[PDB]
Structures are given as structure tokens and as C-alpha cells.
């Protein structure tokens, strides 16, 4: 209810950080399957 | 949870939601959990792509924690703002901006034999006001040789270009003799001390003028956004903003199960806690757990 | 019953850079055909090799592996 | 001898982040007064037991250096916990490597491949990929060589870990990292970059690395 914390209240709110994480969770595991399967 | 390569990146980080992911990870390792073995894999192109996307998860909450010095007088708010972004570079795994942009030059031009191809592959990182002043001086030294000026250094045709480009670099205002004598060094530590004090007098006057040019563009953007908004009637404003707020909520409610949309709507509930905790005691502010 | 070729590398080869190069190349001809060979150097390649079979080219340079890497990730982040 | 006995009586005046950097600084200077380390570890051990996340992971790793070189023990929940936090804080300095340290490690590892016998580039490129074995604590060693029952670690210490003066010996933190790995079964051969990159070619750099490995474990 009232009186959250300090370390809960120090977070910047509408930063990205989780689009950057969601992209890197779908780009890094999708590009390791590109260099393991690569011949020109 | 974190993937154990994020948590190695969040150790020297100092934002809140990354330290509480570290602190609950270190509390798990106190209760006898095994630290998982970090990957001795992920070749040179994938390693530079994980470093690109893990530094940007340290930079993104850190940029939102740095107050812009908008509408301030003096250099020290602009020097504080620049120093907080320097420290955000070091926390996210970047080096000095001098050492990180010159690495960008030598990487984009690893295959350059002529300096006209240097001046076209380092185009994105050098100012077009300075890329043009190095292209006009290039075509004069191209006129004296009538052969492409080489990226060799041993060539005398480059040595007359490098004495003409040094005349350009002092015309912009940057001491090309001081910059060169820093990244080359000297033998004794006493004569290298006086050139480092003269490089860092340029460097601090350099990065202040990039931070102050960034502040003067946010000040000019906000003053034109406001003056466009002050010319509206107040009934238009409230529904232009309620349309933009509701469309942006619905984009986070369309996205189900995503971590970003779960955290987006959880921060909307934390803004509404802030507005409600202030309403209970406005001379006290928000109530923190103490 | 040869097949004439030319190989472009970034630096001049070792004598073991040569031998493991041909076994890469004996599987790019679909016979028991011999490559004679021809050696050129290009510092614009960042290592690897480019074989020109005079009707086709196989570009296993890393200067092209970089370009196909960036074009894969520059198109994958635009969908995610 | 008058700092360390000043520290064994007044180690209640120190915060747990300050008692770590006292014990880490005594261990790096070669102190064996184990009752001074009983006093210093009597502060930090109940502090980690109350809140293990109270200290930085850079300071939990400086405890594991101090709990090793002097050899004074910690509680069973603490000394096993700070052993992982040396594996954490050494990986974090490897992910955030200075890229001229990355240019030095891959240069020293190449000379380590030439010194152990590799005349051509497909042999040095396939050998330096085999030097990157995993440490027992979970971290990654860059040039880690294993011949049967003996292991040799090669350490490159560039310039940020060197003394800033003209003789330029490496700083005390390089013997911190060495003696923790030596207690893990390695024979750490220090290759400093003020000596290594003054050498003109790859053959002289390979005999410098080979002589440094012979000085530490002559089995290799």
C-alpha cells in the first residue's frame, strides 16, 4: 500500500531497457543459428 | 530473471532495477546456488553484438537518471551532465569517448589505401563542416600530385597533406599538435605531464561543448513544442493528450505476455501511486518506506 | 581434365593455408577435377578467400561475412 | 608491523567495506599475522551473514583474495559465497575489457601458440581457441594450458594494471589474481605489456612467453 521503498522508487519508469532486452532475447538466439548455418 | 551475462554487466551498474536484480542474484548465491559457467563461445561478430545490446540496457536506465541542465547558467551544470554520461559510459563497458571513437575510425577504415576513401567511410562520425574542409584541402594536394593521396604516412605526398590538414585542424580551434602529442606520449613522465594537462584542457572544453550543444537543442526543442502548444485552445490540448495517452496505453495492452508491456503498465500503476501518495501529504511528498 | 581457378586472399599464404584451402575448393567442383590454381592478394578482403572459377565465384571472405552479418541483423531488428 | 598491529586492535571501528580493503591490502603486501585477519574478518563475516548483498561484488572478491593469501578462514556460508564472487567479479572485468587488453591477450595467446609449437596461421588460430578453458569457480581463463596433471595460466597485464612510473612494475592486484588462481591449481605466468610490446617480432614474443612459463612451471 503506502510507503513503497527507496530502491523501488529510484527506478526510471518509461525507459526502454525491456525493448532492448526483448530485442536482444530475439536477435542473439536468432543469429547464433545464422553463423552456425552459413555458407555463401 | 537474468541470463548471467546481464548480471555481469550489472555489477558496476548503479541504477535501481539492475542492482536489485544483482542483489537478489547475490542473495541466491549466498544460499548455495551454483554460479553458472559463463560461455567461452559466441565468436567475434556475436560477441560485439551482445556487447552492443547489453551496454544499451545499462545506458537506457542510466540516461533517464541523468537530469539535463536545461536553462542553467555556468559550465558546472554542463560539466556535471557530461561527467554523468562519462560515468555512464564506464559503467556500461565503454572506454573514454576519445578511445572509443578512434576505435570506430580504425575499424571502418581497416582496408583504406587512399585518404579519399578514409574521408568517405568515416563520414558518419566526423562533422560535415569538418569533412568538407578536409575534402577541399585534399583536392589541392590532389592538384599538386595529380595522383590519389595515399593513406601511408611514409609517402611524402601525404606529408604535405598532413601539414595542410593540420592547418585546417587549427582553424577549427582544436590543437592538433596537443592531440597528437598526447596519444603518442613522450619518454619522461615530466614532459608527458604538461601535455596531458594541455590535452585535458582541450578535452574538457571539447566535451562540454558537445553537452552544451545537446542542452541547447533540447532547450530549443522544448521551447518550440511549448509555443506550438500554447497557441492551442485548452479544449484541444486535453483531448489531443488524452488521445495520445489512451493510444499508448492500448499498445501496451495489445501486447500480452511481453516483458516490456508488463513493465510498462506496472509503471503506470507506479505513477498513480506517486500521484496518490502526494495527495495524502503534499508538504511531505511521496511516502517512502523508512 | 582440369578446372582453372584463381584465389584471392588478404595476405600471401602459408604452406598450410594452401592445403586446407584446396579441400575447401575440391568440394566446390562436383567431380574429381583438379584446380590448378592462381594466387592474388587483396587487403580489401579481411581474411578468408575468394575463388573465381571464371564462370562462378565463391566468396568465403570474412569481409563478406561481415556484410552478410550486418544485413541479417539490420533486417531482424526491424521486424522485432 | 605497526600498521597491522594497529589494525588488529581497532578492527571494530571499520565498516565492512573498509575492513575488506584493509585485509585485501595486508594480503597483497604479504602479512601473515593471522590474528589481525581474525579481527578484520570478524567484522565482515557477520555483515555478509546479515545481508550478503550489502557489499559490492568488487569488495566480495577482495575478501576472497584476502581469505586466500593470508589463508585465514571465514564461516562456511561466507567463504564459499565469496569464492563465487571472485568468479563473478573476474568475468565482469573480462566482459568490460579495455579492447587494448583484448588486443594484448590475443597477441600473448598467439605467442603462446607459437611457443608451444605452431608454425602456421591455421595452427595458431586453432590453438588460441583451445586456451580459453573454464576456471573452477565458473569464470573464463583466456590462456589456460593443461598438460595432464599440471596447469599453466598465462596472464597479460597491460598498462592500466602497471605502475605509472618509469620502472613500471605491475600493480599489486596482479599478484592478487595470480595467487588466487595458484590456489586453484594454476601456475600463473605474468606477461607484462611494457616488456612484451617492446619486442619486435612474433618469434621474440614467443620466447619471452616461453621463458615466463618455464620460470613458473618448468614441466611445460
Among D24, D117, D19, which Cα is nearest to D65's? Answer: D24
Does residue C15 belong to the interface with chain D, where contact is any CB pair within 8 Å?
Answer: yes
Beta bridge partners of D190: D155
> Which chains contact B through at least 3 pairs of Cβ atoms less than 8 Å apart?
A, C, D
> Looking at the complex, does the CB of residue A12 fall below 8 Å from at least one CB of chain B?
yes
Give me the phi and psi of D10, to 5 degrees please: -110, 30
CA closest to B49 among chain A residues: A28
Three-state secondary structure call for residue D78: coil
- Cα–chain-centroid distance for residue C12? 14
Closest approach of A23 to chain C, Cα-based (Å) = 6
How far is D52 from D45, CA to CA, in rounded Å? 9
What is the count of residue pairs from B and C with beta carbons less than 8 Å apart? 11
Burial of D59 (0-12, 13-18, 19+ CB in 10 A): buried
Under a CB-based contact definition with an 8 Å cutoff, are residues D44 and D16 in contact?
Answer: yes
Which one, of B235, B233, B268, lies nearest residue B250 by Cα?
B268
Question: D190 by DSSP, 3-state: which?
Answer: strand
Distance CA D10, CA B33 (A): 35
Number of domains in chain A: 1
Nearest-CA distance from B28 to chain D in Å? 9
| Of the partner residues A27, A34, A40, the one whose CB lies closest to the CB of residue C80 | A27
DSSP states along chain B: ---SSHHHHTSS---HHHHHHHHHHHHHHHTTPPPPPPPS---HHHHHHHHHHHHHHHHHHHHTTS---TT--SSHHHHHHHHHHHHHHHHTT---HHHHHHHHHHHHTTT-SBHHHHHHHSTTTS-HHHHHHHHHHHHHHHHHHSSPPBS-SSSHHHHHHHHHHHHHHHHHT--HHHHHHHHH--SSTTHHHHHHHHHHHHHHHHHHHHHHHHHHHHHHHHHHHHHHHTTS-HHHHHHHHHHHHHHHHHHHHHS-S-HHHHHHHHHHHHHHHHHHHHHH-TTT-SPPP-
Angle at B136 between CA B135 and CA B141, to 5 degrees: 90
Tally Cβ neighbours within 10 Å of residue C10: 19
Cβ(B181)–Cβ(B166) under 8 Å? no
Cell of B228: 506550438
The angle subtended at Cα D109 by Cα D104 and Cα D111, nearest 5°, is 95
Q: Could you list the residue range(s) of the whole structural domain that residue A25 is in?
A: 1-40
> Cβ of D14: how many Cβ atoms within 10 Å?
18
SS3 D89: helix
Place of cell 583466456: D142
Resolution in angstrom units:
3.0
For D70, the grid coordinates are 593470508
Q: How far apart are CA B259 and CA B266, in angstroms?
A: 10
C-alpha cell of A18? Answer: 525491456
Q: Which residues of D touch C14 (CB under 8 A)?
A: 119-122
Q: Which of B45, B49, B111 is closest, CB to CB, to C44?
A: B111
Cβ atoms D119, B32 nearer than 8 A: no
Q: Count Cα atoms within 13 angstroms, Cβ side, for B69.
A: 19
Cell of B278: 502526494
Q: Which residues does chain C have within 8 Å of residue A27's beta carbon, measured at their own beta carbons?
A: 73, 76-77, 80
Count of beta carbons in the 10 Å neighbourhood of residue C36: 9
Q: Cβ–Cβ of A40/C69 closer than 8 Å?
A: no
Distance CA A20, CA B57 (A): 6
Q: DSSP for C26-49?
A: TTSSSSSPPB---EEE-TTS-SSE
User: What is the Cα Rg of chain D in Å?
Assistant: 19
Is C69 in Cβ contact with B113 (below 8 Å)?
Answer: no
What single string gives the DSSP state of each residue in chain A? -----STTTTS-SS--SSHHHHHHHHHHHHHHHHHSS---
**CB proximity list for B281: less than 8 A, separation 6 or greater:** B287
Distance in angstroms (rounded) separating the CA atoms of residues D30 and D33: 9
Residues from chain A contacting residue B289 (CB–CB below 8 Å):
3-6
Residue found under cell 567461452: B40
Distance CA C47, CA C56 (A): 20
Grid cell in block for residue C51: 575463388
What's the start-to-end Cα distance of chain B, in Å?
27
Inspect the interface and report whether the beta carbons of D122 and C16 lie closer than 8 Å. Answer: yes
Q: Are A11 and B290 in contact (CB < 8 Å)? A: no
Residue indicated by cell numbers 488521445? B243
- Our CA-based measurement puts residue B184 at a distance from the nearest CA of chain D, in whole angstroms, of 15
Cβ-nearest to A2 among B45, B260, B277 = B277
Is residue B8 a contact partner of residue D88, using CB atoms and an 8 Å limit? yes
- In sequence order, the 6+-apart residues with CB closer than 8 A to the CB of B10 are B2, B18, B19, B21, B22, B58
The kind and range of the H/E element at D4 are helix D4-7
D40: left (phi over 0), alpha (psi -120 to 50) or beta: alpha
CB contact under 8 A, B189 and D52: no
Return the residue of C nearest to B112 by Cα.
Answer: C44
Show the cell assigned to D168.
613500471
* Alpha carbons B284 and C55: distance in angstroms, whole number: 80
Element (H, E) at D42: helix D34-50
- Evaluate whether B53 touches A24 at the Cβ level (below 8 Å): yes
Would you state the cell numbers that stand for residue B194, as one nine-digit string? 604538461
CA dist B86 and B90 (Å) reads: 6
| Residue written as grid cell 611514409 | B154
Amino acid at each position: 500500500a503506502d510507503a513503497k521503498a527507496l530502491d523501488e522508487l529510484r527506478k526510471p519508469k518509461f525507459s526502454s531497457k525491456y525493448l532492448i532486452q526483448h530485442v536482444s532475447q530475439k536477435l542473439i538466439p536468432a543469429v547464433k543459428e545464422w553463423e552456425k548455418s552459413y555458407q555463401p | 530473471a537474468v541470463s548471467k551475462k546481464e548480471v555481469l554487466y550489472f555489477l558496476s551498474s548503479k541504477d535501481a532495477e539492475s542492482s536489485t536484480a544483482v542483489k537478489s542474484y547475490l542473495k541466491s548465491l549466498y544460499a548455495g546456488a551454483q554460479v553458472e559457467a559463463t560461455e567461452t563461445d559466441a565468436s567475434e561478430l556475436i560477441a560485439q553484438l551482445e556487447k552492443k545490446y547489453l551496454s544499451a540496457q545499462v545506458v537506457e536506465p542510466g540516461v533517464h537518471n541523468i537530469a539535463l541542465p536545461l536553462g542553467e547558467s555556468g559550465s558546472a551544470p554542463v560539466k556535471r551532465y557530461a561527467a554523468e554520461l562519462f560515468n555512464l559510459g564506464a559503467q556500461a563497458g565503454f572506454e573514454c569517448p576519445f578511445i572509443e571513437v578512434s576505435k570506430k575510425f580504425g575499424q571502418e577504415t581497416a582496408t583504406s589505401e587512399t585518404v579519399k576513401d578514409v574521408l568517405n567511410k568515416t563520414k558518419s562520425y566526423v562533422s560535415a563542416d569538418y569533412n568538407a574542409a578536409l575534402n577541399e584541402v585534399l583536392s589541392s594536394v590532389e592538384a599538386e600530385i595529380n595522383g590519389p593521396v595515399l593513406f601511408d604516412g611514409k609517402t611524402e605526398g601525404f606529408k604535405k597533406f598532413a601539414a595542410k590538414a593540420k592547418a585546417v585542424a587549427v582553424s577549427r580551434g582544436l590543437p592538433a599538435d596537443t592531440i597528437l602529442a598526447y596519444c603518442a606520449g613522450s619518454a619522461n613522465e615530466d614532459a608527458a605531464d604538461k601535455v596531458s594537462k594541455e590535452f585535458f584542457t582541450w578535452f574538457e572544453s571539447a566535451y562540454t561543448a558537445d553537452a552544451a550543444a545537446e542542452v541547447k537543442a533540447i532547450e530549443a526543442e522544448a521551447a518550440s513544442i511549448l509555443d506550438r502548444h500554447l497557441a492551442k485552445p485548452v479544449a484541444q490540448i486535453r483531448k489531443e493528450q488524452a488521445s495520445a495517452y489512451a493510444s499508448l496505453l492500448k499498445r501496451a495492452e495489445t501486447a500480452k505476455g511481453a516483458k516490456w508491456a508488463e513493465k510498462y503498465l506496472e509503471d503506470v500503476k507506479a505513477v498513480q501511486w506517486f500521484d496518490a501518495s502526494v495527495a495524502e501529504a503534499p508538504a511531505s511528498g511521496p511516502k517512502v518506506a523508512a | 581434365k582440369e578446372v582453372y581457378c584463381t584465389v584471392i586472399t588478404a595476405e600471401p599464404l602459408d604452406k598450410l593455408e594452401r592445403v586446407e584451402l584446396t579441400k575447401k575448393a575440391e568440394k566446390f567442383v562436383d567431380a574429381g577435377f583438379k584446380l590448378v590454381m592462381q594466387e592474388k592478394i587483396d587487403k580489401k578482403l579481411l581474411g578468408g578467400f575468394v575463388i573465381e572459377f571464371s564462370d562462378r565465384r565463391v566468396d568465403m571472405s570474412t569481409a563478406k561475412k561481415v556484410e552478410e552479418f550486418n544485413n541479417f541483423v539490420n533486417k531482424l531488428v526491424l521486424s522485432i | 608491523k605497526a600498521i597491522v598491529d594497529a589494525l588488529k586492535a581497532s578492527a571494530g571501528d571499520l565498516a565492512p567495506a573498509q575492513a575488506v580493503e584493509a585485509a585485501y591490502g595486508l594480503a597483497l603486501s604479504g602479512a601473515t599475522d593471522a590474528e589481525a585477519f581474525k579481527a578484520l574478518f570478524g567484522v565482515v563475516a557477520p555483515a555478509i551473514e546479515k545481508a550478503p548483498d550489502a557489499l559490492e561484488v568488487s569488495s566480495l572478491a577482495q575478501l576472497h583474495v584476502a581469505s586466500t593469501i593470508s589463508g585465514a578462514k571465514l564461516p562456511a556460508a561466507v567463504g564459499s559465497f565469496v569464492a563465487k564472487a571472485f568468479g563473478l567479479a573476474a568475468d565482469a572485468a573480462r566482459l568490460k575489457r579495455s579492447s587494448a587488453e583484448s588486443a594484448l591477450v590475443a597477441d600473448v595467446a598467439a605467442a603462446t601458440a607459437v611457443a608451444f609449437g605452431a608454425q602456421y596461421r591455421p595452427e595458431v588460430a586453432s590453438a588460441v581457441a583451445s586456451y580459453v578453458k573454464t576456471a573452477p569457480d565458473g569464470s573464463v581463463l583466456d590462456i589456460a594450458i593443461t598438460k595432464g596433471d599440471a596447469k599453466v595460466l598465462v596472464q597479460a597485464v597491460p598498462s592500466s594494471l602497471l605502475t605509472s612510473t618509469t620502472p613500471a612494475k605491475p600493480l599489486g592486484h596482479v599478484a592478487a589474481y595470480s595467487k588466487v588462481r595458484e590456489a586453484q591449481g594454476y601456475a600463473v605466468a605474468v606477461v607484462p605489456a611494457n616488456e612484451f610490446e617492446a619486442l619486435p617480432d612474433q618469434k621474440a614474443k614467443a620466447q619471452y612467453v616461453l621463458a615466463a612459463i618455464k620460470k613458473v612451471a618448468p614441466s611445460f
